[PDB]
Ligand binder design. Sequence first.
Ligand code: CLA
Ligand code: CLA
Ligand code: CLA
Ligand code: CLA
Ligand code: CLA
Ligand SMILES: CCCCCCCCCCCCCCCC(=O)OC[C@H](COP(=O)(O)OC[C@@H](O)CO)OC(=O)CCCCCCCCCCCCCCC
Ligand SMILES: CC1=C(/C=C/C(C)=C/C=C/C(C)=C\C=C\C=C(C)\C=C\C=C(C)\C=C\C2=C[C@H](C)[C@H](O)CC2(C)C)C(C)(C)C[C@@H](O)C1
Ligand code: SF4
Ligand code: SF4
Lengths: 69, 139, 73, 80, 31, 142, 40, 40, 740
Amino acid sequence: ALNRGDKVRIKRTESYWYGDVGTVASVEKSGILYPVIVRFDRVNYNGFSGSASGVNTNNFAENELELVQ
Amino acid sequence: ELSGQPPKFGGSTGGLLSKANREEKYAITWTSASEQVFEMPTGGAAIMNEGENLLYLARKEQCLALGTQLRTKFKPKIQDYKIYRVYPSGEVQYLHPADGVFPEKVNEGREAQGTKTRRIGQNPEPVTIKFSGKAPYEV
Amino acid sequence: EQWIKDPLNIRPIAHAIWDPHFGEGAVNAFTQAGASNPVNIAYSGVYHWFYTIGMTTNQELYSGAVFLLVLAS
Amino acid sequence: SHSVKIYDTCIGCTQCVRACPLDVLEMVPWDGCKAAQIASSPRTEDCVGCKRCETACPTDFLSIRVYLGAETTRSMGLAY
Amino acid sequence: MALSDTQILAALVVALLPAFLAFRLSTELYK
Amino acid sequence: DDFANLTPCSENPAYLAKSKNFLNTTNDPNSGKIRAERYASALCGPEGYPHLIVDGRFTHAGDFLIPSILFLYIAGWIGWVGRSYLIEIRESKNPEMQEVVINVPLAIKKMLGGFLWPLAAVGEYTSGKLVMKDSEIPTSPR
Amino acid sequence: MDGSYAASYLPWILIPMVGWLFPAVTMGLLFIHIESEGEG
Amino acid sequence: MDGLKSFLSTAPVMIMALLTFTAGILIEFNRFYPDLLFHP
Amino acid sequence: AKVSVDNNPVPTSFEKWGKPGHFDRTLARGPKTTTWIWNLHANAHDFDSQTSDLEDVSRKIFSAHFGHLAVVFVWLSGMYFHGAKFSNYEGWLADPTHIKPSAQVVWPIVGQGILNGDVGGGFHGIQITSGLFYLWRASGFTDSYQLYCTAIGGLVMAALMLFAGWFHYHVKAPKLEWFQNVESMMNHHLAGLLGLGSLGWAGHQIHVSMPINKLLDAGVAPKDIPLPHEFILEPSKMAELYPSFAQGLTPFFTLNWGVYSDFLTFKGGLNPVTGGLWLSDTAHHHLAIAVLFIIAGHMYRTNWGIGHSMKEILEAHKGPFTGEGHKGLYEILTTSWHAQLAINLALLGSLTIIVAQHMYAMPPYPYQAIDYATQLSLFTHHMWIGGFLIVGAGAHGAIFMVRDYDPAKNVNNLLDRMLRHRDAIISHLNWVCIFLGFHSFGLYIHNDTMRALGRPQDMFSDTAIQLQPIFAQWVQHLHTLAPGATAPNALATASYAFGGETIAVAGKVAMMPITLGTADFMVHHIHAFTIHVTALILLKGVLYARSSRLVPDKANLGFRFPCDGPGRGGTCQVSGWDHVFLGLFWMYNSLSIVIFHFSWKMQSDVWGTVSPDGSVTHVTLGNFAQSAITINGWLRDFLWAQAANVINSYGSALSAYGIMFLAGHFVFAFSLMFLFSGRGYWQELIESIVWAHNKLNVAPAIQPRALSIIQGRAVGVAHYLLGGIVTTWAFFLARSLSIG
Ligand code: CLA
Ligand code: CLA
Ligand code: CLA
Ligand code: CLA
Ligand code: CLA
Ligand SMILES: CCCCCCCCCCCCCCCC(=O)OC[C@H](COP(=O)(O)OC[C@@H](O)CO)OC(=O)CCCCCCCCCCCCCCC
Ligand SMILES: CC1=C(/C=C/C(C)=C/C=C/C(C)=C\C=C\C=C(C)\C=C\C=C(C)\C=C\C2=C[C@H](C)[C@H](O)CC2(C)C)C(C)(C)C[C@@H](O)C1
Ligand code: SF4
Ligand code: SF4
């Protein structure tokens, strides 16, 4: 359902982007239980104390994403 | 049992204490291709001799730090070190590597431990498990 | 019993002082409020409370203390 | 000793095992991720609780969590 | 009038009772 | 009969006694006299210093109301130009780079358009895109 | 250190016990209890 | 030069230039009209 | 010639000015969070981490040092210009005992014109406490035009320094071999810089300063005194002032030096007219040290095989207890800039401490001893500079140990042996710190309790149990007898602090004997305790930076990391940077006690007014002896009593100081925001505020982040030290300007 370039809202309820919007960078079609890959403009808190950047990509299941586009 | 010429060291105050003869100590053994200088985790520099080596340390973390230094800071990389736990009675327990393959790479025959079939957000609420000797992650 | 005779000019006393580490100067300084020994000066305002609620004699205070001992037991 | 748990959001990047200084973690075969491997904590009695494995985890929230518990000589990392 | 020595000693003896009761309560609570 | 404890500075003996020796704030030699004149119309306390009354009354509107309006206009100007510049640069390809290196042309273009910030703000609120919905904002777990 | 209250000799003996004897006895008992290995 | 223009447009330079502009405005106004406690 | 350079290595362009963070690979990518800003201002001047080539690092260091020289030159030129245009130096020169120095004038805008107090002579301005006027009078300045020309020359020198940096980096960059000519550098910098500088200053003094100051001290008006070039043009005046100048330079070349005895003396002591040192004594002094430094040159082999070799000397001094001895240190100090920085910082900080402690006992400048404010300001200022430099040595040594230390080149040498018995060193040092603190501060607390309990006869005082500094008294006695006995050709003592008569100028005591008693014993041993504790902290930082029993791999974690984790019971503040952060506070404590002791003792036992009869009335009377033995005495007779002049400063010319006093008391407290808290709380608060700004669609692209743990600690310590030092500065300046 979710393809490349899809703007989706995150509903994992514990990820850094809960309620934020991201874009679907890739979807892997197999038995993987978190197949969707979503990338975001903002970066999370990931990194050692003093790092100047975080992580702007994550893996999500299909059910925890709401299509917006 | 445990064989190897100890590296030539002048002795330092950072070595073992009474815990070694009272609780336990740790031993690290490796094969060196040349007598060369390396760094004691307890402070100072000592030369290790060609062939077998054997070193007694007080903590497993010190042994693994020495193993990391051996693996990273030498062009003829030393990947054959072995870390044992030596008890005061005399028992020697093989610790690292567990099955002979480094834990970084996946090897068949290992058993999953501490793996939960849910995600971090699906843990039970504490109020539903209170007055029992359990924690949300323990469930 | 002396305080009630002049509440506006007498300092209430909290408890007596017994300190072997004291010196002569401290002993002279802390002998206050008309006492015959080093004493402290009460600042919890219990003298006014006891006076207002009707306690006027030492024996009444003693009976109250014993009764409170019994109540705590 | 402390407890180490690995949740099903692991992608098998093996960074946690590399970051562990006391060799507590291991890489075991799996099927839930593309790398088909998941982290494990067999030697959990040697863990000190430095949280280096948690720092190394790149998921949105840590797929590996460390819960500090009972303290032993090993857990305190004492040399005496 | 100021108290007497017998009054102070009697107060000590009376207070000896809550001490014993408090010891019993502490032992009961520890159990 | 309001402020029976506050007297006019024009008659308060302390203020008149102390206003002769008012210090000169600037290089002008009679700045102290000007200050004494300007403060003689206020409400001085027993110690002779002016007091500002802020209760809504328009007789003392100069104490709070006029500076309040001035500050509100200026602060709204600043906030509106900042928000407009932020929203404008947010559609570019490197919004963060333009945050540290200011786009001075666009910056000044937004700088000069801020004097109509109340009309723009009310039009923004009526258009509905001044305030985002609660479901479109990232939120922390409860 | 000398008082004019009734039974002024009591602080001469009560304070040392509260000062030395009781604290020392309590220190010893607690130290033995918290250090008694086993049985719990 | 383009590089000089870009350097002049950086955050500290803009913030300090605006601060000196505002400070000069305030100082000149207070010089020519001092001691303004209220709109009289 | 050993010169080797590279031509046009780095083009001169403006493009990289428009891309901040270009030096760092992690920052040149572009900011995503606010931390990118704080890193940019923090990793800028750390050239070692930016690149791995040592030659590029050395070139950058050379040009950066040129830049700091240019900045200092601009500062000096500004000082001279502001002393030439906005100062009463010409007025003060005619009446030095009745006019206060002043070189800062305040514009009247919002009532700050009250700061322009009456400094005497009809001049209104801020009184200065740097002592520049006395230095200028000693240098022979008499007109403001000379000061203006000095300022112009300083600006020209600053521009020349800037051009030198640009040339020696962007055009002709020296090679690595050039930088490692430590023998040539040491020769040229001992003989060509220190020796030649001393010779030039001795020539200036003899040919300029002494005649002008001799005429000035006699009573001649400044305008009547001939200009300095007229003495050279017409040596008749010079021969008139000093007869031996009639003999010319013949006795110098014939070793008949004694004839020059009139203007090259060995008097010692103070000049009665001005209260400063004799300029003839200073002339022979700087001449002698010039000769000594030029002789100390020509020592290291550079190009003609005639000289010592540093490596040979280092590798030759080895003994039984030290294994390889001083082997490998030459490669350490010729390949790592950080070790050189550590050694130089330690020695330089101790040098400014020596400067502070020696410039007050023998005041070298005319009319400086009687200006108590200038004395206190100079002492405290250079004291603080020395303390900061020593802490910086303790820091950059640990930086070297983490980064540039290599175990391969250090086997059984002194560094390795140090790394081997480090536990014994730290344990014995910790014990001595505990012993010193216990016994000394317990003397203080014991005195407090004895005084509070009404038993003054059980105290530690001169009337009570004595505790006299017998060794210091003995050395004072020896130095008082030195003229005539052990220094036969000296006329007076080195200083009157040891003993002698009371030198007083203009009815104000310039220098009188400083007696040491029980209080001096206690305070000196308190100083020893504080210094040993600070040394303990910095030594633990340096020695244990590589590893420890708790964390055996701290070297791989870096030099500046907050912690290892909550494991092992908690591993907070284990890096060397954390040891520096902890040692900064103890340096502050020790130096605060030092300056407090100096101020109180100076006010109570030396400074004051002398009557025509000869009696001396001190600033705070003789209250130091009987009050400085209890902490209550320090709190009541020093802080509360002497803070009156700074709390009552409102409404007068000193009001600014009062304001600044409160300012300090604020910032210190403000620092407790960062030292007492952590960053997770602030991160969650920022999360809520970010939600707020997001509701209105005004969220910033650069995501705001709470400060890092290391940044939080650094901000806390910086604001703390700033507040405390500003408080002490305001208090000292107000008190010293309010005591006449
Ligand atoms: C060396 C210093 C020193 C010492 C040892 C004392 C000793 C004493 N002073 Mg004293 N005093 C001193 C200096 C000193 N003073 C000075 C300099 C002054 C100022 C001039 C005074 C002014 C002063 C006054 C005005 C009074 C005293 C009083 C007393 C007595 C109080 C009795 C007591 O402590 O039991 C009570 C003990 C406690 C309350 C213990 C509290 C401390 C612990 C840490 C709290 C408990 C924590 C924890 C729960 C402990 C667990 C249990 C433990 C066993 C593990 C005691 C003899 C009083 C007195 O004589 O009345 C009897 C009194 O009124 N003193
Ligand atoms: C909690 C209440 C309390 C407190 C704080 C004090 C405080 C004091 N009493 Mg005191 N006293 C109290 C109740 C109290 N009294 C009662 C109820 C009695 C009647 C039995 C007495 C009878 C008494 C005598 C006869 C004397 C004192 C003396 C003193 C002083 C010496 C220190 C001391 O207590 O040891 C000595 C006193 C005792 C050991 C009395 C026993 C303590 C009471 C009875 C029990 C209190 C238990 C308490 C609640 C435990 C709390 C636990 C908590 C800390 C965790 C001191 C000022 C001495 C004095 O005047 O010195 C100048 C003295 O000679 N007291
Ligand atoms: C350490 C060096 C130093 C220091 C601390 C001072 C300090 C002072 N000088 Mg001074 N001065 C110095 C060196 C120094 N001077 C030198 C070397 C000269 C010789 C050229 C002078 C010549 C001089 C004169 C002639 C005067 C002073 C005055 C003053 C006082 C008023 C402050 C002032 O000028 O700001 C005034 C305010 C400003 C300069 C603000 C203007 C805006 C600034 C420059 C913002 C900077 C950015 C700007 C927008 C340009 C962009 C650049 C960008 C591309 C990087 C003050 C006590 C004045 C004084 O005491 O009068 C009684 C005065 O008249 N100075
Ligand atoms: C006589 C020769 C001579 C002299 C005077 C100096 C002087 C200096 N060197 Mg140096 N050096 C020399 C030879 C010399 N060097 C040689 C041969 C080498 C190669 C082995 C080096 C390599 C070297 C390095 C690698 C560094 C220095 C640095 C420095 C400066 C340290 C800062 C200081 O002392 O503050 C005191 C400052 C002053 C007294 C101001 C002096 C201003 C100019 C430059 C002095 C010119 C004097 C010259 C003889 C003309 C005067 C004669 C006449 C007009 C009166 C200082 C100016 C450091 C630096 O970067 O500074 C630039 C540094 O890092 N030197
Ligand atoms: C000759 C002096 C000297 C030199 C050349 C260096 C050189 C260096 N130091 Mg070092 N240092 C020194 C003295 C010196 N230090 C002293 C005396 C101390 C003790 C305080 C330190 C403590 C120190 C630490 C703790 C660290 C360095 C680091 C460094 C490296 C560059 C990073 C850096 O600090 O830049 C960046 C500089 C700053 C961000 C400073 C800006 C903030 C300052 C503190 C504000 C000052 C405010 C001012 C006093 C008053 C303003 C008031 C306000 C109201 C206007 C570099 C090798 C760092 C490193 O690891 O490099 C390898 C590092 O972590 N140094
Ligand atoms: C003056 C009175 C006031 C100060 C009194 C304090 C003195 C206390 C100790 C005595 C100093 C003895 C030095 C001899 C020691 C000595 O000269 O050693 C020299 C010896 C090296 O001997 P070698 O001849 O082998 O050395 C060859 C060297 O040239 C290295 O190449 O070093 C050692 O044996 C190890 C040093 C152990 C040092 C123990 C630590 C002592 C720390 C405390 C010192 C404190 C002094 C503080 C005040 C300055
Ligand atoms: C539009 C705008 C923005 C946004 C603005 C927003 C979203 C505003 C939202 C406001 C809300 C939600 C609520 C506001 C409440 C205001 C209240 C309660 C005002 C009360 C006033 C009182 C009580 C007046 C009191 C007395 C009034 C009287 C005149 C005297 O003095 C005496 C005195 C002081 C008692 C920014 C911030 C993004 C940028 C700005 O430039 C423009
Ligand atoms: S907390 Fe540290 S020791 Fe424990 S598993 Fe993680 S990395 Fe290993
Ligand atoms: S770091 Fe995280 S994602 Fe990577 S292997 Fe370990 S638990 Fe899995």
